[PDB]
Design a protein around this ligand. Structure first.
Ligand SMILES: COC(=O)c1c(OC)cc2cc3c(c(O)c2c1C)C(=O)[C@]1(OC)C(=O)C=C(OC)[C@@H](O)[C@]1(O)C3=O
Ligand SMILES: [Mg+2]
Ligand SMILES: [Mg+2]
Ligand SMILES: [Mg+2]
Ligand SMILES: [Mg+2]
Ligand SMILES: [Mg+2]
Ligand SMILES: [Mg+2]
Ligand SMILES: [Mg+2]
Ligand SMILES: [Mg+2]
Ligand SMILES: [Mg+2]
Ligand SMILES: [Mg+2]
Ligand SMILES: [Mg+2]
Ligand SMILES: [Mg+2]
Ligand SMILES: [Mg+2]
Ligand SMILES: [Mg+2]
Ligand SMILES: [Mg+2]
Ligand SMILES: [Mg+2]
Ligand SMILES: [Mg+2]
Ligand SMILES: [Mg+2]
Ligand SMILES: [Mg+2]
Ligand SMILES: [Mg+2]
Ligand SMILES: [Mg+2]
Ligand SMILES: [Mg+2]
Ligand SMILES: [Mg+2]
Ligand SMILES: [Mg+2]
Ligand SMILES: [Mg+2]
Ligand SMILES: [Mg+2]
Ligand SMILES: [Mg+2]
Ligand SMILES: [Mg+2]
Ligand SMILES: [Mg+2]
Ligand SMILES: [Mg+2]
Ligand SMILES: [Mg+2]
Ligand SMILES: [Mg+2]
Ligand SMILES: [Mg+2]
Ligand SMILES: [Mg+2]
Ligand SMILES: [Mg+2]
Ligand SMILES: [Mg+2]
Ligand SMILES: [Mg+2]
Ligand SMILES: [Mg+2]
Ligand SMILES: [Mg+2]
Ligand SMILES: [Mg+2]
Ligand SMILES: [Mg+2]
Ligand SMILES: [Mg+2]
Ligand SMILES: [Mg+2]
Ligand SMILES: [Mg+2]
Ligand SMILES: [Mg+2]
Ligand SMILES: [Mg+2]
Ligand SMILES: [Mg+2]
Ligand SMILES: [Mg+2]
Ligand SMILES: [Mg+2]
Ligand SMILES: [Mg+2]
Ligand SMILES: [Mg+2]
Ligand SMILES: [Mg+2]
Ligand SMILES: [Mg+2]
Ligand SMILES: [Mg+2]
Ligand SMILES: [Mg+2]
Lengths: 62, 397, 131
RNA sequence: GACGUCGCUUUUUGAUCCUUCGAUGUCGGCUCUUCCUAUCAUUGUGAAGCAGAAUUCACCAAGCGUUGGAUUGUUCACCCACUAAUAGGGAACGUGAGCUGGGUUUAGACCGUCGUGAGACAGGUUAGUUUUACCCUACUGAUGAUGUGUUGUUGCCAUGGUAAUCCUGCUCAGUACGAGAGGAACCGCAGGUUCAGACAUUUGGUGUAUGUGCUUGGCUGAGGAGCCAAUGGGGCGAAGCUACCAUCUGUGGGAUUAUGACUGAACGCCUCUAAGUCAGAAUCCCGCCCAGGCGGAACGAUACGGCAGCGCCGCGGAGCCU
RNA sequence: AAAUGCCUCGUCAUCUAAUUAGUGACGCGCAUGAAUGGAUGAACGAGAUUCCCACUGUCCCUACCUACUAUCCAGCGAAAC
RNA sequence: CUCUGGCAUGUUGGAACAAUGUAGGUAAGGGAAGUCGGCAAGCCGGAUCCGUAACUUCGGGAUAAGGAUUGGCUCUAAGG
RNA sequence: GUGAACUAUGCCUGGGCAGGGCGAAGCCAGAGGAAACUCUGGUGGAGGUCCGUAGCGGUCCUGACGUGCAAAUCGGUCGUC
């Protein structure tokens, strides 16, 4: 029961959910849902998307 | 001539009149075979479909690729509060089959049971079984009743217990109870008769009927879909895009010269609301309900000895379209017929489980309680609010 | 030992995947899947770990106009992997092998699925990463 | 199995002209069901010029399966490839108020050959309207009807349907067998194909929750809030529905067939057969599962606050109809 | 071997994994051929044909959604046969 | 899309939202394997700046093919 | 005997046909040559010219409809303009 962190949003992915995307560069990514997946493939910046942990840690919301 | 390319039969002919089920409960239609060497026990039970979730367990399958590794499996949750035995029926086997000899009911039958006996409880005078419990409390009626018991002992071959579910413990709108005949197995007729009359007017839990990690059968009524065409109802091939009078048809129904449409071609009609009997459903866990010792405790639900949290089987926001489970539940492996809130007959298997796929003791590592009302990402409210910190409404509070 | 579980296929006959080893092929054009008995009108399809019969459409001329056995190593279609996780790749890729599973090439560019790395030990040896 | 000879079949083509010309829609494919067996595979067997592996010839056997493509209107054919195998047929040469309309087979037109010509061609080419179900039956589902006084609950099972199928890998074992090359099988274990029945936790699809952001043109004096553009577009999306595009489940006996035998005569010997026994299968029948009869069962309750009904105990009486 | 070639799916080459299709050749051509016009053409074509790129529910293999129907009702109310 | 002008949804309404339709969408992974045949649908699309082949009757082909950019807001030059 | 109120064609007299692309002849200037002339940039606005409205027509879906709205219509897609 390993818990992974979402690559785009930085949420905890519990072991039945989400998808995993392996790129041709050998780097793999984990997505909690298709919202995070589509934002990643559309190359958005998680430090610019308001509801992500990276945004909130950059903007010191914690 | 000669359909020119072999294709198998679309759909099964072992399942048709493909009509609406005449019952809502689900008749057993075959109980396990009786051998008097066993102890006295019941053979079936009556639960309600709450919802689905998934689990994590570690598999012990030697030679398999997932040996000593962790897998994720879907499970179905069936709420099973204890059933009240309120009656007992006996059967004698005749050369015309097996007919009911004599029923005996109990004194003080509950109002949800009488609700089952009435079609309009609101306008009724609720008079059912009043003259019967009169003869229970009498003494001339009492010797009549024990005479019926003794006659049943000396003549009947198959006894069954009439038990109802108690719907006041369920989150459902329905107050009318479900009654059921459950065959009693394993003994002489006298032994099982005194056992059943001991259990008369009384509660029987699913802990006493079933056990951990055995394989049972689920009987129920398939989810209802209404009037469907042949493409949904029989999964025939769709006709090409340029078809004049419709695509979702069967293009040919029989030859010229049997001169009739046969019973074995695909036609449109009712899909779903079908009585099905699925077998080999493995029990993963039997719950324990919401007991009160002190300031009460719900960890006896999904606390799995590897997380040690204080969460119930219920997800965040409860089970969608059901409610919440506050009673004894049964976690089965896999999917199960019917809607949510659908009543499921559960019965013991009538094969023998000698298989390494069967006879396997399971051990859960994790039980997923995220919200099913969306893409829920938290297990408990404490975990959610500890991850998020204080909110605006919490701050103003 | 252990047999492969069923995965989602999503790679039918007419598919053109890219050749992922140093043999000099660029494309692989699937014409078949090894082990398909099939069904009326159903297209035979492959997934990661499957041996296919393939032609190479652009590549070296001494490879081009022939039929080779190939093994699918990466699929763009998502498949459940029985620890719960659904996995998919950026591309569709396979390598040219012979009948007994030896690679025609010598080095594989990019990740190789675990569902084929455990099946083909000569493919997993030449791999860089096992995703 | 030569020379000969006896048959069967109507999936070939003829022969015939009995039915139909006040019209039975005329090729092929697609779709879908069922049947046959003259068995390609699979089950159980016998034989071999059967050591093994592979194969060939027979028997019970039609339960189950028999594919994806290139070219051609094609049926046929031929090739590529996969496969346990890629068997053969019938049902008005099954199937056009099911489609399609590529071919053929009206009227337009071109070519070749023929004809003085108008024109012909079972020669090639191109373009060419495929109509109607609301009736009866059949079938698929849906109410209901028939007796048990009424009504309800719980049940039984007559009868009808019926379902699972095939293949890999490991072990056996590089063993038996074989000089060698090669090279099995049973039990067991792990999975998969085809099919069936479900289901929605997860992944995916849908999405007018017209949910919430963005955005074009216009409109409400602007802001704010909104609206119109036959769903303005687009992003993400709950619930629900839904996919081998996710997940789950798919089972037991009996009599026996081919066959191999036991005892044992006929025929003081022998003999599976005559009397009498045995083992025996993807067959068959039943179970399991689906439906539940102008088919039964057990049990519950059985009509007023008023004149008001009903049931039982009467041979208790008088009679009426049928 | 053409909108003209029966034999014929002519033979060779190319195109494909595979091509009675296409194109390039060949020619004793059933039965081609010179204003019954022969051979060529750039441009053009709701003309016939073949292949490739891109694109897609045409398919694998179907599903979901919307409008109007169909459905049920009130009024009205035919026809073919 | 709106104003002036005009109208009452095209010979009826109500309630539901089954199949089959008719019209319109969307679709994972493949990408014509479908089919007689890419039929139908889809892709592309405006403008600006580059860049355009064979062939040719030298006119064309030609928007051949191919590529980049495109909003909002604040300015700076030039053109009477 | 009666019909050119539809349609076919001639004549007479009227009416009509956005917005764009390409850029023919003619012309002006600059530059190179001994001439002959050549090159470059503009200007100009030709054509049974192109994209495309109104109009006219009617390809394909072998779409709808096919006891129709209609004894030939409707929708999208199209041809020309
Ligand atoms: C051989 O395939 C046919 O079975 C066939 C057909 O297959 C679709 C269509 C037609 C169509 C038609 C006719 C046919 O005979 C005909 C035939 C035989 C006629 O005879 C027609 O009257 C109806 C007429 O008299 C004048 C014309 O030409 C003189 C035709 O165009 C005509 O108008 C027509 O529509
Ligand atoms: Mg057949
Ligand atoms: Mg049509
Ligand atoms: Mg959910
Ligand atoms: Mg097909
Ligand atoms: Mg005749
Ligand atoms: Mg005669
Ligand atoms: Mg006739
Ligand atoms: Mg007639
Ligand atoms: Mg007729
Ligand atoms: Mg007929
Ligand atoms: Mg036989
Ligand atoms: Mg069968
Ligand atoms: Mg026929
Ligand atoms: Mg017919
Ligand atoms: Mg027809
Ligand atoms: Mg035709
Ligand atoms: Mg005619
Ligand atoms: Mg005509
Ligand atoms: Mg003609
Ligand atoms: Mg002549
Ligand atoms: Mg033709
Ligand atoms: Mg035409
Ligand atoms: Mg009707
Ligand atoms: Mg039966
Ligand atoms: Mg939206
Ligand atoms: Mg705006
Ligand atoms: Mg205002
Ligand atoms: Mg505003
Ligand atoms: Mg308005
Ligand atoms: Mg979406
Ligand atoms: Mg599935
Ligand atoms: Mg015998
Ligand atoms: Mg026996
Ligand atoms: Mg037996
Ligand atoms: Mg030709
Ligand atoms: Mg072709
Ligand atoms: Mg040629
Ligand atoms: Mg044309
Ligand atoms: Mg309207
Ligand atoms: Mg109105
Ligand atoms: Mg009007
Ligand atoms: Mg798609
Ligand atoms: Mg896609
Ligand atoms: Mg195609
Ligand atoms: Mg094709
Ligand atoms: Mg085909
Ligand atoms: Mg088209
Ligand atoms: Mg060109
Ligand atoms: Mg800018
Ligand atoms: Mg006139
Ligand atoms: Mg013009
Ligand atoms: Mg126009
Ligand atoms: Mg039209
Ligand atoms: Mg039409
Ligand atoms: Mg034009």
């Amino acid at each position: 029961m390993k818990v992974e962190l979402c690559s785009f949003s930085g949420y905890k992915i519990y072991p039945g959910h989400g998808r995993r995307y392996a790129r041709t560069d050998g780097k793999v990514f984990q997505f909690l849902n298709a919202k995070c997946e589509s934002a990643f493939l559309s190359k958005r910046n998680p430090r610019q998307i308001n509801w992500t942990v990276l945004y909130r840690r950059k903007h010191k919301k914690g | 001539s000669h359909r020119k390319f072999s294709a198998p039969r679309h759909g099964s002919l072992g399942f048709l009149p493909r009509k609406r089920s005449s019952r809502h409960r689900g008749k057993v239609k075959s109980f396990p075979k009786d051998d008097p060497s066993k102890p006295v026990h019941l053979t079936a039970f009556l639960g309600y479909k709450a919802g689905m979730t998934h689990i994590v367990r570690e598999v012990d399958r030697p030679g398999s690729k997932v040996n000593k590794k962790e897998v994720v499996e879907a499970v179905t949750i069936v709420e099973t509060p204890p059933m009240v035995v309120v009656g007992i029926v006996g059967y004698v086997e005749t050369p015309r089959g097996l007919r009911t000899f004599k029923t005996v009911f109990a004194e003080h039958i509950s109002d949800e049971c009488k609700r089952r006996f009435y079609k309009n409880w609101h306008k009724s005078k609720k008079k059912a079984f009043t003259k019967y419990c009169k003869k229970w409390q009498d003494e001339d009626g009492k010797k009549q009743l024990e005479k019926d018991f003794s006659s049943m002992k000396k003549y009947c071959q198959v006894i069954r217990v009439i038990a109802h579910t108690q719907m006041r413990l369920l989150p459902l709108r329905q107050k009318k109870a479900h009654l059921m005949e459950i065959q009693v197995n394993g003994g002489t007729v006298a032994e099982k008769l005194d056992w059943a009359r001991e259990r008369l007017e009384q509660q029987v839990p699913v802990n006493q009927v079933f056990g951990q990690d055995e394989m049972i059968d689920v009987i129920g009524v398939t989810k209802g879909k209404g009037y469907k065409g042949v493409t949904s109802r029989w999964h025939t091939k769709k006709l090409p895009r340029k078809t004049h009078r419709g695509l979702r048809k069967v293009a040919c129904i029989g030859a010229w010269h049997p001169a009739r449409v046969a019973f074995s071609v695909a036609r449109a009609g009712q899909k779903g609301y079908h009585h099905r009997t699925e077998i080999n459903k493995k029990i993963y866990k039997i719950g324990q309900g919401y007991l009160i010792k002190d300031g009460k405790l719900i960890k006896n639900n999904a606390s799995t000895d590897y997380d040690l949290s204080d969460k119930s089987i219920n997800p965040l926001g409860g089970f969608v379209h059901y409610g919440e489970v506050t009673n004894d539940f049964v976690m089965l492996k896999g999917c199960v017929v019917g809607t949510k809130k659908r009543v499921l007959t559960l019965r013991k298997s009538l094969l023998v489980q000698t298989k390494r796929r069967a006879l396997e003791k399971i051990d859960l590592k994790f039980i997923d309680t995220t919200s099913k009302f969306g893409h829920g990402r938290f297990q408990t409210m404490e975990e959610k609010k500890a991850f998020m910190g204080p909110l605006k409404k919490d701050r103003i509070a | 030992s252990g047999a492969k579980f069923r995965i989602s296929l999503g790679l039918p006959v007419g598919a053109v995947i890219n050749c992922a080893d140093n043999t000099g092929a660029k494309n692989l054009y699937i014409i078949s899947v090894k082990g398909i008995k099939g069904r009326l009108n159903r297209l035979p399809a492959a997934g990661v770990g499957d041996m296919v019969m393939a032609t190479v459409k652009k590549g070296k001329p001494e490879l081009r106009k022939k039929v080779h056995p190939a093994v699918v190593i990466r699929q763009r279609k998502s498949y459940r992997r029985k620890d719960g996780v659904f996995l998919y790749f950026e591309d569709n890729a396979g390598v040219i092998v012979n009948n007994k599973g030896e690679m025609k090439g010598s080095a594989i560019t990019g990740p190789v699925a675990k569902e084929c790395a455990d099946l083909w030990p000569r493919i997993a040896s030449n791999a860089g990463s096992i995703a």
